[PDB]
């Protein structure tokens, strides 16, 4: 086991943490003191990540109030020990991680068994300081965390020596060099960015002229514009000639941590909101006072919404400020109202907050185990008082907030009974049931959202469960693989809070245009708001455009590895998601793809394209050619490389294999074509020593001269190109392979390749398509004959897909002296896998549920909302208020450019439309479009204009688009360009035709 990582489970997490990091995690034993919501959330996340063993310590008996945020406790468990009822359910999350229970902790020395000790809100500050001194002086990593209502903190102490090995987890920067001067000024190539900050370190390779500068030596970086940097003298090494590629390196960093006692007096802060800087110090005293209080008052916290205890705490804070004047700062008074809010909420347990700190803390643990990412140094404090509703609508006093013998008791402690009722009666749509979706549903079960007689949840997802999802989508188990995410997940949370039983509508419908008959005008008009747990841009902008049309709030979010964001979309007030979208990855120029690659990304893109061509497009085309008797007409219409479609057909049929050995020969021959003949061919067309552009050698800069390959079955990439090509072609023609039986023996393949003849490379419009038509077989000769197309599945390691692409890419990499890449890197690029971890997912989801509270109060003050960006690598928190909507003006009338629209009753006539807008709005419709089609234009010729100008809109659509409008459709959205009274084009709202 020692040194292996189950890639099928951990794939998405490995791309975040790396192999090395995960191996150090698998030697580390973690202990968590206190298993309420904060504990179980931290533990859930650490156990999913994969450490050596998880041990939990909580002997106290279960109470109903503890069910506010502990998703693993039920009503039936009351009275029992929290550790014992939590451990079994924790154990289910990762069979590779054993979960144990510490009966007792009166012997502090038991902590020596452990590598990381996390102490939650059940441990006194007295005991926290004791346990920390023991950890600090024994070399054990100590982390601590507390939630008090809508407030919270975390404290990190990794000891006198700790080494950060990779501080950001981002991939190292590189770039091609054109010149190195004696003083060390590296000038880049042809206008590429390096991306390097001051004090980075870099190595060089392929630098001709400076021999021992390529041997692994590091150079510190002084940046000189975006296209240059300096690295000190280089006269000793030689004199620059040509070529060269630099590569960034992260050097280790030794950092030191101070004990908890030392930091209570002199804390080091990491800020969670730069708009609340001043609160950090206030809360540092406050949180300590909350312990001095509990010592004085028999362990009890301030009573909920109680003023006596609040003024007592304000006293305790003032007194502490006089003991510690550097921690509050000169001339800085106590923020009495903040401390007052702290006491009013000391007893609260808020799902969204418990999730925020659970995810963040779980990550601080993996950094403690592994040396990956920069730990928090050292204290961090957080509040979300912007979640509180307007006191006028929902009063907060000692009667609104008292308990009522419910699970939601410690949420009422913050918000009041009537407000929790409003949460319960909410009608909400959750699009997607994946990592964010599962965390969202747990949070909603803990909230009771939709549990009311007026409320409900609709959750939808057309995907199933795969094993790699079990690492962060924790409502699913290995026995659930294959089932539908939404149905398993809704069943899963009704177990957790049976108050939701029968109130979650779990669909398996994909959200897009084709399912608008299920999700109809009536479906949307009922909802209070919409929540996205989507992973792709088409689904996010479709849901967005639908929330704009129906004027419904939208809660959008997302994660990339350690990074996450949240966005709040409010009708009539903020921008939508589509406004502030991201630009998809740059397409690779066709010249770099087809003839002059310089990265492995170019050989994998080329290799995928070739996979898709060989084993999918070709079968699809042969089966279309035998099925559709007018394929040739549609293919001549179909402009792109028609001769290559017809040559694909003719190849598939003129030489079809009948046994596996013919597939082997085909694969070896293709090897020769792609990597020997085609390379020699390119070299004939542009010779190695060709000096074409300016007098300079042709293969200079980003152009690398290739070398034809001499097949060597002992070269692993050469071998697996033929093994995979052979098995995939065998699949295309329904030919049983001997490798599906057992794994491939090289002597078998070598015996066939040894008795093969290898053609030498010979270097050298209407007739060309007709002779190919005549050569093709007539479909009538081939009965029942089908080719089986291949459907690229990246996550099946037996199916030869990534195997072929790896080999193919890497062979082409050999061709162009590009370093090869392993199976996992190819899977990541070829398969476009997004790195994911459960820690970031939980944190983001919590922040989202802290904005949901604001939606329930119909808040319309844009400043009360918070859009989040986190990077747990750093760790960095950065909130900002949402951007207000663009506004526009036509004819001195102002309108909202995202949300406003003209409403028109009935399937009006185009003429009546134009006249209605000139009389009523002063706009002269110039151009009018429906979806993708242009219906009307003011510049149209007479014959085009008169036939269109007389039609009603639905008939107009049918005329222009050649399609009936369905009967289910109730409304249509039209886009117009128009002129104003002055004759100048103006941007104007859209039109909603209520039929």
């Amino acid at each position: 086991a020692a040194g292996e990582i189950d890639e099928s489970l951990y794939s998405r997490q490995l791309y975040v943490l790396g192999k090395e990091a995960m191996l150090k995690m698998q030697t580390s034993n973690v202990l968590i003191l206190g298993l309420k919501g904060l504990g179980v959330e931290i533990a859930k996340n650490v156990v999913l990540a994969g450490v050596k063993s998880m041990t939990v310590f909580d002997p106290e008996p279960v109470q109903l109030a503890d069910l506010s945020t502990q998703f693993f406790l039920t009503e039936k468990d009351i009275g029992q020990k929290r550790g014992d009822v939590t451990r079994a359910k924790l154990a289910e999350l990762n069979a590779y991680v054993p979960v144990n229970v510490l009966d007792s902790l009166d012997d502090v020395t038991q902590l020596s068994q452990f590598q990381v000790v996390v102490a939650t809100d059940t441990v006194s500050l007295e005991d926290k300081v004791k346990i920390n001194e023991f950890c600090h002086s024994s070399g054990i990593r100590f982390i601590s965390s507390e939630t008090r209502g809508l407030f919270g903190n975390t404290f990190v102490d990794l000891g006198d020596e700790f080494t950060v090995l990779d501080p950001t987890g981002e991939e190292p920067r590189t770039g091609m060099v054109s010149d190195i001067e004696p003083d060390g000024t590296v000038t880049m190539l042809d206008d590429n960015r390096h991306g390097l900050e001051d004090g980075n370190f870099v190595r060089f390779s392929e630098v001709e002229g400076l021999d021992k500068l390529n041997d692994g030596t590091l150079f510190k970086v002084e940046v000189l514009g975006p296209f240059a940097f300096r690295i000190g003298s280089v006269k000793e090494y030689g004199e620059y000639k040509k070529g060269g590629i630099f590569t960034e390196v992260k050097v280790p960093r030794k950092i030191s941590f101070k004990s908890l006692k030392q930091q209570l007096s002199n804390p080091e802060f990491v800020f969670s909101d730069f708009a609340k800087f001043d609160r950090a110090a206030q809360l540092h005293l406050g949180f300590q006072a909350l312990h001095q209080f509990a010592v004085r008052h028999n362990g009890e916290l301030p009573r909920t919404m109680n003023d006596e205890d609040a003024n007592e705490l304000i006293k305790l804070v003032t007194d502490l400020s006089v003991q510690q004047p550097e921690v509050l700062g000169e001339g800085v008074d106590v923020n009495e109202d903040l401390i007052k809010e702290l006491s009013y909420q000391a007893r609260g347990d808020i799902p969204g907050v418990v999730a925020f700190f659970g995810g963040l803390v779980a990550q601080e643990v993996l950094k403690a185990c592994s040396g990956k990412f920069t730990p928090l140094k050292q204290f961090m404090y957080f509040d979300s008082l912007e979640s509180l509703p307007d006191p006028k609508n929902f009063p907060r006093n000692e009667k609104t907030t008292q308990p009522v013998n419910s699970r939601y008791d410690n949420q009422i402690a913050v918000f009041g009974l009537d407000f929790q009722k409003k949460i319960a009666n909410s009608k909400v749509f959750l699009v997607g049931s994946g990592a964010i979706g599962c965390e969202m549903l747990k949070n909603w079960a803990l909230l009771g959202l939709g549990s009311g007689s007026d409320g409900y949840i609709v959750v939808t997802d057309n995907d199933s469960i795969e094993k790699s999802n079990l690492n962060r989508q924790f409502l699913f188990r290995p026995k659930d693989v294959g089932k539908n995410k939404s149905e398993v997940a809704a069943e899963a949370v009704c177990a957790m809070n049976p108050d939701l039983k029968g109130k979650i509508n779990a669909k398996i419908d994909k959200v897009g245009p084709e399912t608008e008959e299920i999700f109809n005008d009536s479906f949307w008009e009922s909802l209070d708001f919409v929540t996205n747990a989507l992973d792709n841009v088409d689904a996010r902008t479709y849901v967005d455009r639908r929330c704009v049309f129906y004027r419904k709030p939208l809660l959008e979010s997302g994660t990339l590895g350690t990074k996450g964001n949240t966005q709040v979309i409010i009708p009539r007030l903020t921008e939508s998601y589509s406004s502030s979208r991201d630009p998809p990855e740059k397409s690779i120029p066709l010249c770099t793809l087809r003839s002059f690659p310089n990265k492995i990304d170019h050989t994998i893109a080329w290799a995928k394209s070739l996979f898709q061509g060989y084993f999918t497009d070709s079968a699809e085309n042969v089966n279309m050619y035998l099925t559709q008797p007018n394929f040739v007409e549609q293919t001549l219409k179909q402009s792109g490389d028609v001769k290559g479609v017809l040559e694909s057909i003719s190849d598939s049929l003129s030489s079809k294999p009948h046994n596996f050995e013919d597939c082997i020969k085909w694969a070896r021959l293709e090897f020769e074509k792609k990597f020997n003949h085609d390379i020699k061919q390119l070299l004939f067309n542009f010779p190695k020593d060709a000096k074409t552009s300016n007098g300079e050698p042709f293969w200079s800069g980003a152009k690398r001269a290739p070398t034809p390959l001499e097949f060597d079955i002992y070269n692993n990439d050469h071998f697996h190109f033929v093994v995979a090509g052979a098995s995939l072609r065998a699949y295309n023609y329904g030919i049983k392979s001997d490798d599906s039986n057992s794994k491939p023996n090289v002597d078998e393949y070598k015996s066939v390749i040894d008795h093969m003849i290898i053609p030498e490379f010979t270097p050298n419009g209407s007739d060309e398509i007709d002779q190919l038509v005549s050569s093709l077989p007539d479909p009538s000769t081939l009965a029942g004959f089908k080719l089986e197309p291949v459907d690229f599945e990246k996550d099946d390691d037996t199916n030869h897909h990534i195997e072929f692409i790896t080999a193919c890419s890497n062979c082409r990499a050999q061709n162009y002296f590009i370093e090869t890449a392993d199976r996992q890197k190819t899977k990541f690029i070829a398969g476009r896998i997004i790195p994911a971890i459960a820690t970031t997912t939980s944190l983001v989801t919590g922040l989202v549920n802290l904005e949901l509270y604001k939606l329930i109060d119909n808040k319309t003050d844009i400043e009360q909302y918070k859009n989040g960006f986190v990077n747990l690598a750093l760790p960095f928190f950065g909130f900002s208020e949402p951007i207000a909507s663009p506004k526009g003006e036509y004819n001195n009338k102002k309108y909202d450019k995202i949300w406003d629209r003209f409403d028109i009753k009935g399937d009006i006539k185009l003429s009546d439309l134009i006249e209605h807008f000139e009389k009523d709005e002063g706009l002269e419709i110039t151009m009018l479009s429906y979806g993708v089609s242009l219906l009307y234009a003011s510049f149209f010729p007479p014959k085009k204009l008169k036939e269109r100008l007389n039609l009603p809109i639905t008939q107009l659509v049918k005329l222009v688009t050649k399609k009936d409008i369905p009967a289910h459709v109730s409304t249509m959205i039209l886009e117009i360009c128009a002129d104003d009274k002055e004759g100048e084009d103006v941007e104007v709202p859209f039109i909603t035709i209520h039929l």
């Binding site: 206008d191 960015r193 991306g195 975006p226 841009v537 979208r581 630009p583 998809p584 990855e585 740059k586 397409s587 690779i588 120029p589 066709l590 010249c591 087809r594 003839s595 402009s639 792109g640 490389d641 001769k643 290559g644 390119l682 067309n685 542009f686 060709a690 074409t692 552009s693 663009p886 450019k897 110039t926 151009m927 479009s929 993708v932 089609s933 242009l934 234009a937 510049f939 222009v960 688009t961 050649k962 886009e975 360009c977 084009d985 941007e987």
Partner: protein
């Protein structure tokens, strides 16, 4: 704040701008396919200046636009693949302007890249400017490249035959400007 307008509307406005006879822009005939798909234009390209080797040639083309215009680029391909040093059998082109530069773009500092501020007329200007002055820093593995580099008479002979084939597709369609 550059391109607040819709994608559909943006292409329509640039379609009306480039099809206006009064505007009269530097010779480019463009019309939508089936006057219905906004996001797929058919474009006839004629060469302006006599000094270049492609003068007096009408080469048809299609421009396909993506849903997220203009923060992605459009695809361009000649409806008949032509004899050009930067044209593959497909009809697709080696141009630096139709690909994104990547990472923080910040200034897009020295030359020729796709941006949101970039316009369709700009793409069409650069297709013509690359046609009349071919670019040999990014050649394509077509016969046309090798012939331009050695500089035999065959290069200009196959340019002429292609310009004659291009002239073959102008009479159909009364108004020839």
């Amino acid at each position: 704040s550059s391109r607040k307008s819709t994608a559909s509307s943006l292409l329509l406005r640039q379609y009306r701008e480039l099809t206006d006879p009064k505007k009269a822009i530097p010779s480019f005939h463009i019309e939508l396919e089936d006057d219905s798909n906004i996001f797929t234009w058919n474009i006839g390209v004629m060469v302006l200046n006599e000094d270049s080797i492609y003068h007096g040639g009408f080469f048809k083309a299609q421009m396909r636009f993506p849903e997220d215009f203009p923060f992605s680029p459009p695809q361009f391909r000649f409806t008949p693949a032509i004899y050009h040093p930067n044209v593959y059998r497909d009809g697709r082109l080696c141009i630096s302007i139709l690909h994104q530069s990547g990472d923080p773009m910040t200034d897009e500092p020295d030359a020729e890249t796709w941006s949101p501020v970039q316009t369709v007329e700009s793409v069409l200007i650069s297709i013509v400017s690359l046609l009349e002055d071919p670019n040999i820093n990014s050649p394509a593995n077509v016969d046309a490249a090798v012939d331009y580099r050695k500089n035999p008479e065959q290069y200009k002979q196959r340019v002429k035959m292609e310009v004659e084939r291009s002239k073959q597709d102008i009479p159909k369609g009364f108004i020839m400007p």
